[PDB]
Amino acid sequence: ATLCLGHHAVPNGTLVKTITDDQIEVTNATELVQSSSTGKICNNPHRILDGIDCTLIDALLGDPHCDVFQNETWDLFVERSKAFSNCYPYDVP
Amino acid sequence: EVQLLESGGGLVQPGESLRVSCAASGFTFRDSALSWVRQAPGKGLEWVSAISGNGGATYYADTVKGRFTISRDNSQTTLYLQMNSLRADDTATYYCAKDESPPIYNLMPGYYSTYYYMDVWGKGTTVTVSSSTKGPSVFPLAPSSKSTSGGTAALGCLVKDYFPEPVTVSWNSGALTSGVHTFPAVLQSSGLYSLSSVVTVPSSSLGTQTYICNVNHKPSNTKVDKKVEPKSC
Amino acid sequence: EIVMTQSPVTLSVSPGETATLSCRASQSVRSNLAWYQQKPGQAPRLLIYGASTRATDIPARFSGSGSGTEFTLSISSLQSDDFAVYYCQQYNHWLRTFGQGTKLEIKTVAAPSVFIFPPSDEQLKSGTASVVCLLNNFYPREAKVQWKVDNALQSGNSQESVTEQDSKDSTYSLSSTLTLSKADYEKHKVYACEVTHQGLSSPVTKSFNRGEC
Amino acid sequence: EIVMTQSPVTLSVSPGETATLSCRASQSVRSNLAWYQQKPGQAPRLLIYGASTRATDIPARFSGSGSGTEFTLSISSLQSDDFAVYYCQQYNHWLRTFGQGTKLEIKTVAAPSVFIFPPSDEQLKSGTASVVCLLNNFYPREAKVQWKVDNALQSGNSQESVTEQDSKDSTYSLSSTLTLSKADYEKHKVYACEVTHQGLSSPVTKSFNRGEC
Amino acid sequence: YFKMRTGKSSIMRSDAPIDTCISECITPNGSIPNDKPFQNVNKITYGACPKYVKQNTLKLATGMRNVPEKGFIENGWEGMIDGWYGFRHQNSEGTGQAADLKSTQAAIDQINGKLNRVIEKTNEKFHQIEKEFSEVEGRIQDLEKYVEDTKIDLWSYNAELLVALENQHTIDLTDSEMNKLFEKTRRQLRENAEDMGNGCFKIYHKCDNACIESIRNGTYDHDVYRDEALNNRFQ
Amino acid sequence: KYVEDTKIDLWSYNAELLVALENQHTIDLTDSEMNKLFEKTRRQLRENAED
Amino acid sequence: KYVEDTKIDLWSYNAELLVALENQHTIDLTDSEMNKLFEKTRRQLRENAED
Ligand SMILES: *[C@@H]1O[C@H](CO)[C@@H](O)[C@H](O)[C@H]1NC(C)=O
Ligand SMILES: *[C@@H]1O[C@H](CO)[C@@H](O)[C@H](O)[C@H]1NC(C)=O
Ligand SMILES: *[C@@H]1O[C@H](CO)[C@@H](O)[C@H](O)[C@H]1NC(C)=O
Ligand SMILES: *[C@@H]1O[C@H](CO)[C@@H](O)[C@H](O)[C@H]1NC(C)=O
């Protein structure tokens, strides 16, 4: 009688890096680097506050189009590039 | 549906053995793991043991390490748990539960993924380990004075002296559910539990309706349907 | 082999407020910490697993948070049916352990509707007549119930049975069973269960005579 | 098993300007990337090895660079003799692979001088008469040539032969040979070569009758 | 006056639209899942986010060394779906195959254990320092760019060295689980069979299907066949 | 605050990975020395005993 | 000064730890190739010779 021993093998596997081999084939691997994105900022769980048309300092001062942002709490204020200032010209040292 | 039902259990004396089944029905293809979790009457939960697809477990809590042995029969899709050398503190409602892991773990589908949370819980089977299976004596509770209070009257039944829990109680074969209050069992100093179930219905139905409490005690197969009438005076 | 300690043992929170629970754990645990909602008379239900991540089709008011050692569970908008007990398990040491448990209460101070129940004739013929005093619908759970038989207090033969908090009106119900013999019952005339509650201006007492309804 | 892709397939760069080449490589490769300059009719010659280290006694105008995946090759001062094809290899997983190759072009739309050619009598007696049409001196190489026999368009019997670009006037030449049998040739009367070019206002067509020069 | 409080709040410049979903991590490109230890979308992140590294892909081995066709065996067994390590036999009844559940589980547990070590909860960072700049500010801005770029290049080395070591140890631990499995049964039949030099044992005695199963589940008593196998070896 | 916070988090990983690697290698080297001891006495008995 | 001194001291640990692990593995792997060769010829002889 004969009793052979061996391991499983996949028809096509993934290549990984090791200390000695740069491209060595294994049966299974997982990606640790998150490279894909949904493209959209999920409003939850963090209380996302869309800056829309003004910056945070513009809402702090009280620009006419930013009266809605008064007494508004936020976990993360998101400034848009489309922001602008309509009120009196100012500068903050 | 991922339903699973626990069968067996009951009253055992200390030092005896007991096997509890768990019919794994539904979504579980049973290449996924399963566990047993007991909770003692009034006490917190406790993980007992686990089993994987095929025989990758083993894995028993230190409280029951040498006493319990978990078994799996995939051909009939049933999970077992042989509880040998039972002690007093083993009295608990043994729950059968499915175990799920994050998809990153569990490389080969059949084998044990060491990081499991239980998502699907079973109905549970009550196992009592003590030293006597008495049938409950049902005594009705009649209202006194004049319509108890006035606009609403109260009446109930007394389930005194029985062993062990539980006792099923309904009113008028389940047709009466509104206003019913089923109280928890209280172990008397004699050692036999006592239960009371009362219902508050308006006094306008004191005479036009005959109320019957349908007490069922399967552990001792005693099912009394006592009549509750106002005290004749 | 890895103990879990929940704090506190029981908390009282008004409906609507956020109830923050604790699950302190010896050693380090991060990848797994499951929260459960075991309502009385039912099996536990999975709420959050691995911390943070909540279970399928459970309300968004159940929030989970925790890194290691310290873990928290906050219920945003509290409902009257949330009177369940909450537990926390974890990984691993190959051996999952559960928490001790955190009882959650709801809340208006309701006054007990006292009702007396004389022993039935069938129980009188048995040899031991037990008088029952009901306290239907009341909050909070604390209720000092005393038995007075013939203007004399009786202690040692009464047992207090309290139900779990209700899922809708959030009111408890108490019952006291005064166990006495057949001759010990007929020995006295008037039976009155003295009831004193937190929200009770005067001690309401309901009584009845022997041989008359 | 580690494919290499050079971009573009061919690039036009005036003499003296810097010509940047691309050698995109699937999977990481850093320690080895050799550039080669294979002039037509000769063996390849090593330029750069590793990534930036150039070979011995080669001009300093050849520059090399690149990270793991993206590689570049820039020729600073371009000369007329740099009309060679460039290749890039890499390492390794025991198997060395070469690139596709990047032809280096250097630097008026010319009109194709169409010429027809009837089959000779020696070819007619063989049994298969093939008519030939010449497009001498024209740019660009793109030239849509169509055969029209007894006015009928003929496809599946024609073969396009195009020269390399000329070293002086830089004009291509094209020849099409419509192979037909002895009876298939006498079957029809007039043979016309419908020639359409990029810089052609109207489709120039030259034709001849059968039995008359 | 404004009410002064100190908390987890922050600010970030982004043009990504807001959607009604859940995500612990938020980037100027959009929310990304923090299930992975590292990310390559953007260095500006808010909340529980993976560590930004230069690498675009870092495969972590969750399996074993793959050999389909031409160390001890010429190739692995593609027909094994019930486990990682298994047996094959040519006995008197026929030819069968079965997996060793304990060796497969032991190899999965080591990978599952380190898999948790690599994906352990990532850093939770809220209000940090700005890493993108609109115009040149000189010395202060040059330091801020240097502080962050240093942190990135150091983390990139920490991540790329991690996958190399973890995968090198992954192949070593899985290959050693088979060396121990071949050594397990090698001790089972000491001088009842001999190593053929290719991963197969030449059992010199009559061994049926149940006898093969006795070797598989670890109940093979060599003394039963020791009087038989030894005679077939030297005669 | 960021420079110091960055310095700490990088050293925390440098130390956490250190003890993880060294303890693994400590267990690895101790188990090997046991195998090296069992292999030492195994060579002393070429065919005088069996494992 | 602090940012640079941090970068230096952190890279020095990265380099010192690298040469120690790579050299240890180098000595570890070379001894295995010697053992594999001993095991290779050991499989050929079977019971025709003894270690
Ligand atoms: C794996 O995929 C590639 C396809 O290019 C090829 O080698 C073959 O079809 C598959 N199987 C094996 C064993 O290589
Ligand atoms: C690879 O491993 C993952 C777990 O990370 C598992 O879900 C998947 O089924 C495996 N696939 C293969 C082909 O091994
Ligand atoms: C993310 O956005 C930045 C610009 O802020 C851009 O440079 C980068 O390529 C983007 N990456 C992805 C993965 O979208
Ligand atoms: C091992 O397999 C043999 C052959 O089927 C069987 O007789 C024996 O009972 C098995 N033992 C165990 C422990 O499974």
* CA–CA distance, D175 with B161 (Å, rounded to integer): 113
Same domain, D58 and D129: no
Tally Cβ neighbours within 10 Å of residue D108.
6
- Interface present between E and C (3 or more CB pairs within 8 Å): yes
Domain boundary among C107, C126, C141: C107
Query: Does residue B121 belong to the interface with chain C, where contact is any CB pair within 8 Å?
Result: yes
| B164-177 b/e (C-beta count within 10 Å ≥ 16 → b) | bbbbebbbeeeebe
Query: Does residue A23 belong to the interface with chain E, where contact is any CB pair within 8 Å?
Result: no
| Residues paired with E46 in a beta bridge | E26
Report whether D22 contacts D7 (CB < 8 A): yes
E62 CB less than 6 Å from ligand 2? yes
Cβ neighbourhood burial of D113 (10 Å; 0-12, 13-18, 19+): middle
Report whether D133 contacts D176 (CB < 8 A): yes
| Residues paired with D18 in a beta bridge | none
Centre of ligand 3 to C-alpha E29, Å, is: 6
Gap between the terminal Cα atoms of chain E: 104
| D48-69 b/e (C-beta count within 10 Å ≥ 16 → b) | bbebeebeeeeeeebbbebeee
Query: Does residue E195 belong to the interface with chain G, where contact is any CB pair within 8 Å?
Result: yes
Query: What is the bridge-based pairing of β-strands E18-22 and A41-44?
Result: parallel
Centre of ligand 3 to C-alpha E217, Å, is: 56
Tally Cβ neighbours within 10 Å of residue G38.
10
Same domain, C103 and C148: no
* CA–CA distance, D2 with D93 (Å, rounded to integer): 8
Same domain, C93 and C186: no
Query: Does residue E217 belong to the interface with chain B, where contact is any CB pair within 8 Å?
Result: no
Same domain, D4 and D101: yes
Quick one: CA torsion of G27, G29, G30, G35, rounded to 10 degrees? Answer: 130
Tally Cβ neighbours within 10 Å of residue C194.
17
Q: Whose CA is nearest to atom 11 of ligand 2?
A: A28
Same domain, C119 and C198: yes
Nearest CA in chain E to G8: E150
> Residue E86: how many CA atoms within 13 Å on its side-chain side?
17
Gap between the terminal Cα atoms of chain G: 62
Q: Which range of residues forms the domain containing residue C6?
A: 1-107
Ligand nearest to the CA of B115: 2
Ligand nearest to the CA of E208: 4
Q: Does the distance separating the beta carbons of B105 and E116 come in below 8 Å?
A: yes
Centre of ligand 4 to C-alpha E217, Å, is: 6
* Helix %, strand %, coil % of chain E (to 5): 40, 20, 45
Q: In the sheet that D205-208 helps form, which strands lie side by side, from edge to edge?
A: D152-154, D143-149, D191-197, D205-208
Tally Cβ neighbours within 10 Å of residue E5.
7
| C13-27 b/e (C-beta count within 10 Å ≥ 16 → b) | beeeeebebbbbbee
Resolution (Å) of this entry? 3.5
Question: B1-131: which CATH topology?
Answer: Immunoglobulin-like (2.60.40)
Identify how many contiguous H helices and E strands chain D contains and give both numbers: 2, 18
Tally Cβ neighbours within 10 Å of residue D15.
13
Domain boundary among D43, D72, D107: D107
A23 CB less than 6 Å from ligand 2? no
Residue type, E69: E
Nearest CA in chain E to G47: E194
Mutate to test the pocket of ligand 3, among E13, E41, E132 (most ligand atoms within 8 A of CB): E41
Cα of E34 to nearest chain C Cα, Å: 12
Residue A51 structure tokens: 């800056």
Total domains, chain C: 2
Tally Cβ neighbours within 10 Å of residue B137.
18
Q: Does the distance separating the beta carbons of E18 and A78 come in below 8 Å?
A: yes
* CA–CA distance, A50 with A80 (Å, rounded to integer): 8
Report whether A49 contacts A63 (CB < 8 A): no
Q: What are the chain A neighbours of D25 within 8 Å (beta carbons)?
A: none
Query: Chains meeting D at 3+ CB pairs closer than 8 A?
Result: A
Q: Whose CA is nearest to atom 13 of ligand 1?
A: A11
- Scanning F23-42 for CB atoms below 8 A from G yields 25
Centre of ligand 4 to C-alpha B84, Å, is: 23
Cα separations in angstroms, A61 against A55, A70, A73:
10, 10, 16
Any idea what DSSP says for residue A68?
A: G
* CA–CA distance, F39 with A16 (Å, rounded to integer): 34
Tally Cβ neighbours within 10 Å of residue A41.
27
Same domain, C118 and C170: yes
Same domain, C98 and C115: no
Query: Chains meeting C at 3+ CB pairs closer than 8 A?
Result: B, E
Residue C173 structure tokens: 């119900």
Cα separations in angstroms, C112 against B196, C115, C142, C143:
18, 9, 11, 9
Cis? peptide before B166, omega within 30° of 0: yes
The closest of A61, E108, C193, E200 to B53, measured between CA atoms, is E108
Residues 6+ apart with CB under 8 A from C55: B119, C45, C46, C47, C48, C49
Q: Does the distance separating the beta carbons of B104 and E35 come in below 8 Å?
A: yes
* CA–CA distance, D208 with D206 (Å, rounded to integer): 7
Identify the three-state secondary structure at position C141.
Answer: coil
Q: Does the distance separating the beta carbons of E168 and G47 come in below 8 Å?
A: no
The closest of A32, A38, A34, A41 to E39, measured between CA atoms, is A34
Report whether A66 contacts A58 (CB < 8 A): yes
The closest of C122, C116, C112 to C148, measured between CA atoms, is C116
* CA–CA distance, A7 with A20 (Å, rounded to integer): 22
Same domain, C115 and C207: yes
Q: What are the chain D neighbours of A17 within 8 Å (beta carbons)?
A: 28
Cβ neighbourhood burial of E152 (10 Å; 0-12, 13-18, 19+): middle
Candidates 3.40.605.10, 3.40.50.720, 2.60.40.10, 3.90.550.10; CATH matching B132-230: 2.60.40.10
Tally Cβ neighbours within 10 Å of residue C62.
18
Centre of ligand 4 to C-alpha E218, Å, is: 8
Residues 6+ apart with CB under 8 A from D29: D2, D68, D69, D90, D91
Same domain, D45 and D121: no
Centre of ligand 3 to C-alpha E17, Å, is: 14
| Residues paired with D194 in a beta bridge | D146, D205
Q: What is the DSSP string of E5-58?
A: --SS-EEEE--PPEEEEE-S-B-TT----TTSSEE-S-S--BEE-PEE-S-S--
Domain boundary among C85, C107, C129: C107
Centre of ligand 2 to C-alpha B108, Å, is: 7
Q: What are the chain G neighbours of E150 within 8 Å (beta carbons)?
A: 3, 6-7
E132 CB less than 6 Å from ligand 3? no
Measured over the CA atoms of residue B165, residue B169, residue B173 and residue B178, the dihedral's sign is negative
Residue D209 structure tokens: 């009758």
* Ligand 1 atom closest to Cα of residue E78: 13
Q: Does the distance separating the beta carbons of E63 and B107 come in below 8 Å?
A: yes
Same domain, C15 and C88: yes
Q: What is the DSSP string of A1-31?
A: -EEEEEEB--SS-EEE--SS-SSEEES-EEE
> Residue D148: how many CA atoms within 13 Å on its side-chain side?
15
Any idea what DSSP says for residue B146?
A: T
Same domain, D124 and D168: yes
The position carrying tokens 């010697």 is G34
Same domain, C142 and C210: yes
Ligand nearest to the CA of E63: 2
